[PDB]
Design an enzyme around this catalytic site. Structure first.
Site, short mmCIF file in Angstrom:
data_model
loop_
_atom_site.label_atom_id
_atom_site.label_comp_id
_atom_site.label_asym_id
_atom_site.label_seq_id
_atom_site.Cartn_x
_atom_site.Cartn_y
_atom_site.Cartn_z
CE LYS A 95 -2.72 -0.72 3.67
NZ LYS A 95 -2.70 -2.23 3.57
CG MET B 19 -10.51 -1.60 15.19
SD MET B 19 -10.80 -0.14 16.44
CE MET B 19 -8.97 0.36 17.17
N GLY C 186 -5.09 2.67 14.88
CA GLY C 186 -5.32 2.13 13.48
C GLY C 186 -4.76 3.31 12.63
CD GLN C 187 -8.28 7.63 11.57
OE1 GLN C 187 -8.24 8.64 11.04
NE2 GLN C 187 -9.23 7.61 12.70
CB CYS D 125 -10.62 4.17 15.98
SG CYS D 125 -9.44 3.15 15.51
CG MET D 126 -7.30 4.75 17.99
SD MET D 126 -6.96 2.89 18.17
CE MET D 126 -5.93 2.66 19.47
N1 MGD Z 1 -5.30 -2.92 5.23
C1 MGD Z 1 -5.81 -1.89 6.06
N2 MGD Z 1 -5.03 -1.70 7.01
C2 MGD Z 1 -5.26 -0.96 7.98
C3 MGD Z 1 -6.71 -0.24 8.04
C4 MGD Z 1 -7.60 -0.46 6.55
O1 MGD Z 1 -8.69 0.18 6.35
N3 MGD Z 1 -7.04 -1.34 5.70
N4 MGD Z 1 -7.30 0.67 8.89
C5 MGD Z 1 -6.68 1.03 10.01
C6 MGD Z 1 -7.38 1.46 11.27
S1 MGD Z 1 -8.06 2.88 11.32
C7 MGD Z 1 -7.65 0.66 12.08
S2 MGD Z 1 -8.76 1.00 13.54
C8 MGD Z 1 -7.02 -0.96 12.17
C9 MGD Z 1 -7.96 -2.08 12.43
O2 MGD Z 1 -7.11 -3.09 12.68
P1 MGD Z 1 -7.67 -4.59 13.23
O3 MGD Z 1 -8.77 -4.29 14.66
O4 MGD Z 1 -6.44 -5.28 13.46
O5 MGD Z 1 -8.74 -5.09 12.05
P2 MGD Z 1 -10.22 -5.64 12.05
O6 MGD Z 1 -10.35 -6.60 10.99
O7 MGD Z 1 -11.26 -4.45 12.26
O8 MGD Z 1 -10.38 -6.40 13.37
C10 MGD Z 1 -9.43 -7.08 13.86
C11 MGD Z 1 -9.93 -8.54 14.52
O9 MGD Z 1 -10.89 -8.51 15.39
C12 MGD Z 1 -11.77 -9.51 15.51
N5 MGD Z 1 -12.99 -9.97 16.18
C13 MGD Z 1 -14.24 -9.87 15.92
N6 MGD Z 1 -14.71 -10.26 17.11
C14 MGD Z 1 -14.08 -10.01 18.29
C15 MGD Z 1 -14.29 -10.32 19.78
O10 MGD Z 1 -15.15 -10.61 20.17
N7 MGD Z 1 -13.21 -10.33 20.38
C16 MGD Z 1 -11.88 -10.10 19.80
N8 MGD Z 1 -10.93 -10.25 20.51
N9 MGD Z 1 -11.64 -9.84 18.36
C17 MGD Z 1 -12.67 -9.73 17.70
C18 MGD Z 1 -12.13 -9.63 13.70
O11 MGD Z 1 -12.42 -11.15 13.84
C19 MGD Z 1 -10.88 -9.17 13.16
O12 MGD Z 1 -10.41 -10.19 12.71
O13 MGD Z 1 -6.29 -1.01 10.74
C20 MGD Z 1 -5.53 -0.01 10.30
N10 MGD Z 1 -4.66 -0.66 9.15
N1 MGD Z 2 -18.40 -1.73 9.80
C1 MGD Z 2 -17.25 -0.97 10.56
N2 MGD Z 2 -17.24 0.44 10.21
C2 MGD Z 2 -16.05 1.03 10.59
C3 MGD Z 2 -14.86 0.12 11.22
C4 MGD Z 2 -15.13 -1.26 11.38
O1 MGD Z 2 -14.20 -1.99 11.68
N3 MGD Z 2 -16.32 -1.70 10.87
N4 MGD Z 2 -14.03 0.93 11.73
C5 MGD Z 2 -13.92 2.27 12.09
C6 MGD Z 2 -12.54 2.74 12.17
S1 MGD Z 2 -11.50 2.29 13.38
C7 MGD Z 2 -11.88 3.89 11.60
S2 MGD Z 2 -10.60 4.65 11.56
C8 MGD Z 2 -13.03 4.51 10.73
C9 MGD Z 2 -12.51 5.14 9.32
O2 MGD Z 2 -13.64 5.56 8.76
P1 MGD Z 2 -13.26 7.07 7.58
O3 MGD Z 2 -12.18 8.05 8.33
O4 MGD Z 2 -14.73 7.39 7.16
O5 MGD Z 2 -12.74 6.28 6.48
P2 MGD Z 2 -11.71 6.87 5.21
O6 MGD Z 2 -11.90 6.13 4.10
O7 MGD Z 2 -10.16 6.92 5.90
O8 MGD Z 2 -12.13 8.45 4.89
C10 MGD Z 2 -10.88 9.18 4.76
C11 MGD Z 2 -11.62 10.25 3.95
O9 MGD Z 2 -10.55 11.28 3.74
C12 MGD Z 2 -10.54 11.66 2.36
N5 MGD Z 2 -9.30 12.60 2.25
C13 MGD Z 2 -8.04 12.02 2.00
N6 MGD Z 2 -7.02 12.78 2.09
C14 MGD Z 2 -7.61 14.03 2.52
C15 MGD Z 2 -6.96 15.49 2.57
O10 MGD Z 2 -5.78 15.78 2.57
N7 MGD Z 2 -8.09 16.30 2.96
C16 MGD Z 2 -9.24 15.91 3.25
N8 MGD Z 2 -10.12 16.91 3.32
N9 MGD Z 2 -9.85 14.78 2.80
C17 MGD Z 2 -8.99 13.89 2.35
C18 MGD Z 2 -10.64 10.57 1.62
O11 MGD Z 2 -10.99 10.69 0.29
C19 MGD Z 2 -11.76 9.64 2.42
O12 MGD Z 2 -12.83 10.24 1.87
O13 MGD Z 2 -14.02 3.61 10.14
C20 MGD Z 2 -14.89 3.05 11.15
N10 MGD Z 2 -15.98 2.44 10.43
S1 SF4 Z 3 2.69 2.75 7.53
FE1 SF4 Z 3 1.18 1.05 7.35
S2 SF4 Z 3 0.24 1.15 5.18
FE2 SF4 Z 3 1.98 2.40 5.41
S3 SF4 Z 3 3.71 1.15 4.69
FE3 SF4 Z 3 3.89 0.74 6.83
S4 SF4 Z 3 2.49 -0.87 7.19
FE4 SF4 Z 3 2.40 -0.36 5.01
MO MO Z 4 -9.43 3.18 13.11
#
Ligand code: MGD
Ligand code: MGD
Ligand code: SF4
Ligand code: MO
Length: 720
Positions: A46, A305, A342-343, A137-138
């Site tokens: 990525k 998460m 995560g972020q 998230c956090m």
């Molecule tokens: N490729 C990629 N990488 C990312 C992101 C992305 O969008 N894409 N987003 C970033 C952000 S903002 C975040 S918050 C992180 C999220 O990173 P993670 O939290 O690691 O990813 P998730 O798939 O949301 O959830 C992790 C696991 O928690 C598990 N889970 C479900 N139910 C339960 C439960 O009851 N107990 C426990 N202990 N676990 C359970 C799910 O099965 C899932 O496999 O990733 C970050 N990095």
């Molecule tokens: N069902 C489900 N939903 C979830 C989660 C889950 O585990 N399950 N995870 C949650 C978690 S941990 C997170 S972090 C949230 C993330 O949820 P979001 O933050 O809504 O997801 P993103 O796709 O990162 O949205 C980022 C946006 O920023 C815009 N963008 C990028 N660069 C810039 C810039 O320079 N300026 C501006 N103004 N905009 C920009 C992108 O185009 C995109 O539209 O999702 C949550 N939602």
């Molecule tokens: S900061 Fe995250 S998405 Fe970016 S290169 Fe490192 S592990 Fe990959």
């Molecule tokens: Mo997140």
């Protein structure tokens, strides 16, 4: 080949990889890893493919207006756009008071954007309606850390991975969500084959394939699982009395002080044989997990998460800390309790800078009268200007918007129409015909823009300079590598012009650029337990990150928080080697959290757990990674993961189209049948804007952190 290389940070995950951006004739042509940052020059795919995103032309390059509800976004000038924005905001406060306006931001904003927004709102307008996605998230990890240690953020760093001897990885698909990080853990076990890895997750993901033991517990029963570990630890005399008698306090089910015997008696509710039935796991996994965790020379927990997106998120964070507190696996190289963020900037921007509705910069809080005085003084405000009550948290914010209590709102760098839970309800709210919604947004395909009344074109990523603080307390700088396209502007400047135009006192937004705002924010931190005064822009250009506390220019930063002679906040002449100075008596706290379940649990009418997850090839709403052709070769569309044996028993074949249905909605998906999901469980990704799965999820929130429970609800499945 590039002419020059500009140092910055990956725009994606909380791993916070350092990056170097190669440019020629003012155009980015190549990317590589910062050899000097923690990631040592490595980047996942990525990160490696960010240049086509940076270079994409499918970008929001002029301001746009929607004259009327349900019309088309038409071009407007920055001048017309700004006046519009400031007049609506000001007029709204004038009519209805400042709680009629709100900021909704993100841990993707630079620390400087979130700092200025936070200030304009809380200090300028006089409203605490500042919130943002890290609530989703956090916020559970923050609650867990404050209640256990009295201060937010981990006391360890990534460098602890190189030194752990056991890794307890729960609620974390580290392999797909923190790939460079998962490699560092993989590398550790490969260096030392003696290392034990325990992956606890109801799903079986790539992460578990390096694990010695995979605990596939029933969703929502991990609390019971962790109490049970504690029972095994204490029962087998594997605990650490010399640590806990000196550094720990105990709290019972009711949060009244208790002691070790109370802990012992409370745990008797969580014996391995009973808990194994509840968790639906062999009993030897509990003994296995607890012994590995406690017998190891250094133990590190990592979670994400699966632990936080939960009505019981704070409590689950506490239970992970309890394991470390009862064994003293903490405040030591390799032994630490390390929440994954995560972020890229949830930590630096929103948690540390206090850009949440109940918070104030640098570990300060809204309800706290002394803290507000601290800030009125620091921000040169009149006495009593900071409202004494928290603003709306996120879910209550969009509920506020739905009733018309909140009339104006800025959404900045987030896609809430795609990512809030309970979408049908939210979408209704975002459609309040009398609302005025301003989206600062880079990519025109964000679904949320379908609701914007006004859209401003931001500089994206390294089209401007600014700071990111990743999950390990590293503050890292991204310099400016290219000019932004068209009429795009750095949001920092946009916010200032917005505040001057809306009548905010201009002493308050006295900033030419991000460097200015960083210097004031250094000041606001000075002398708190977040002090990063030593992090001047000079140092941050030279360095590939510094880690706080970092209180002066000759301070190297801090690896181990709470440790005498390693954390400047601990007095050299403190009588003991550790000091949990976030609690008034220097003791961390073990909490007897009753183990419950999800807010919506399966029953005959809806027999399955539905969960939602991260996929490696797509970042969130896919407005960025979806611009990169090779990132589609694995996962182009949404799917539902169904268990082999649940599939066998109900006649679902792999590849088959099924309806997934919950109380709130129903939706067709191709079924991906396997052993990834344990029996009784189904799973969905959320990257597809054509399959908006948050329509399916409930909305229920942890009562303390107000995080939604995206990870568990009750669903049923049927052949389409
Ligand atoms: N490729 C990629 N990488 C990312 C992101 C992305 O969008 N894409 N987003 C970033 C952000 S903002 C975040 S918050 C992180 C999220 O990173 P993670 O939290 O690691 O990813 P998730 O798939 O949301 O959830 C992790 C696991 O928690 C598990 N889970 C479900 N139910 C339960 C439960 O009851 N107990 C426990 N202990 N676990 C359970 C799910 O099965 C899932 O496999 O990733 C970050 N990095
Ligand atoms: N069902 C489900 N939903 C979830 C989660 C889950 O585990 N399950 N995870 C949650 C978690 S941990 C997170 S972090 C949230 C993330 O949820 P979001 O933050 O809504 O997801 P993103 O796709 O990162 O949205 C980022 C946006 O920023 C815009 N963008 C990028 N660069 C810039 C810039 O320079 N300026 C501006 N103004 N905009 C920009 C992108 O185009 C995109 O539209 O999702 C949550 N939602
Ligand atoms: S900061 Fe995250 S998405 Fe970016 S290169 Fe490192 S592990 Fe990959
Ligand atoms: Mo997140």
């Amino acid at each position: 080949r590039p002419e020059k290389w500009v140092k910055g940070v990956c725009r994606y995950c909380g791993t916070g990889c350092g990056v170097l951006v190669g440019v020629k004739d003012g155009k980015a042509v190549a990317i590589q890893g910062n050899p000097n940052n923690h990631n040592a020059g490595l980047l996942c795919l990525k990160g490696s493919l960010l240049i086509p995103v940076l270079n994409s032309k499918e970008r929001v390059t002029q301001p746009l207006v929607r004259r009327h509800k349900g019309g088309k976004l038409e071009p407007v000038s920055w001048d017309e756009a700004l006046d519009l924005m400031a007049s609506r905001f000001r007029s709204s406060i004038d009519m209805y008071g400042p709680n009629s306006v709100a900021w909704y931001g993100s841990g993707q904003c630079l620390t400087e954007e979130s700092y200025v927004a936070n200030k304009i709102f809380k200090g300028g307008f006089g409203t605490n309606n500042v919130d943002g996605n890290p609530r989703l998230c956090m916020a559970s990890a923050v609650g867990g850390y404050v209640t256990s240690f009295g201060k937010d953020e981990p006391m360890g760093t990534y460098a602890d991975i190189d030194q752990a001897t056991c890794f307890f990885i729960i609620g974390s698909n580290t392999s797909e969500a923190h790939p460079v990080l998962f490699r560092r853990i993989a590398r550790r076990k490969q260096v030392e084959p003696g290392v034990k890895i325990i992956v606890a997750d109801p799903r079986r993901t790539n992460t578990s394939r390096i694990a010695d033991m995979h605990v596939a517990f029933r969703p929502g029963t991990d609390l019971a699982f962790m109490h049970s570990m504690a029972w095994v630890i204490i029962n087998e005399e594997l605990d650490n009395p010399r640590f806990w008698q000196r550094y720990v306090n105990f709290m019972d089910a009711e949060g009244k002080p208790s002691d070790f015997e109370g802990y012992k008696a409370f745990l008797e509710n969580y014996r391995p044989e009973k808990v194994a039935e509840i968790c639906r796991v062999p009993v030897e996994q509990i003994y296995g997990a607890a012994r590995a965790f406690a017998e190891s020379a250094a133990t590190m927990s990592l979670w994400c998460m699966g632990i936080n997106q939960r009505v019981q998120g704070v409590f689950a964070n506490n239970l992970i800390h309890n394991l470390h507190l009862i064994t003293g696996q903490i405040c030591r190289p390799g032994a630490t309790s390390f929440s994954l963020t995560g972020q890229p900037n949830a930590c630096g921007g929103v948690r540390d800078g206090g850009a949440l509705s109940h918070l104030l910069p640098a570990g300060r809080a809204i309800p706290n009268a002394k803290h507000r005085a601290e800030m009125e003084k620091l921000w040169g405000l009149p006495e009593g200007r900071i409202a004494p009550e928290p603003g709306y948290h996120t879910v209550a914010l969009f509920e506020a918007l739905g009733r018309g209590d909140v009339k104006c709102m800025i959404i900045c760098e987030t896609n809430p129409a795609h990512t809030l839970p309970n979408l049908n309800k939210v979408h209704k709210a975002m459609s309040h015909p009398e609302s005025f919604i301003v989206c600062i947004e880079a990519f025109p395909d964000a679904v949320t823009l379908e609701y914007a009344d006004l859209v401003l074109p931001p500089a994206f990523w390294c089209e401007r300079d600014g700071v990111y603080g990743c999950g390990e307390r590293r503050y890292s700088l991204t310099e400016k590598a290219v000019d932004p396209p068209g009429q795009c502007r750095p949001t920092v400047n946009t916010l200032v012009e917005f505040a001057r135009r809306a009548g905010v006192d201009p002493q308050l937004v006295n900033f030419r650029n991000a460097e200015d705002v960083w210097n004031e924010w250094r000041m606001v931190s000075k002398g708190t337990t977040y002090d990063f005064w030593g992090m001047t822009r000079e140092r941050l250009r030279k360095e590939s990150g510094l880690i706080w506390p970092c209180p002066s220019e000759d301070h190297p930063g801090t690896s181990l928080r709470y440790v005498r002679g390693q954390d400047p906040c601990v007095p050299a002449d403190h009588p003991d080697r550790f000091f949990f100075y976030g609690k008034p008596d220097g003791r961390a706290v073990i909490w007897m959290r009753p183990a419950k379940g999800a807010a919506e649990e399966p029953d005959a009418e809806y027999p399955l757990y539905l969960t939602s997850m991260r996929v490696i090839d797509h970042w969130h709403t896919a407005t960025m990674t979806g611009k990169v052709p090779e990132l589609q070769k694995a996962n182009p569309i949404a799917f539902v993961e169904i268990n082999e044996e649940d599939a066998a028993r109900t006649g679902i074949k792999h590849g088959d189209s099924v309806i997934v249905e919950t109380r709130r909605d129903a939706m067709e998906l191709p079924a991906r049948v396997s052993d990834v999901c344990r029996p009784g469980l189904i799973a969905v990704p959320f990257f597809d804007p054509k399959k908006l799965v948050n329509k399916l999820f409930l909305d229920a929130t942890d009562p303390v952190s107000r995080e939604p429970e995206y990870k568990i609800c009750a669903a049923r499945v049927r052949k389409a």
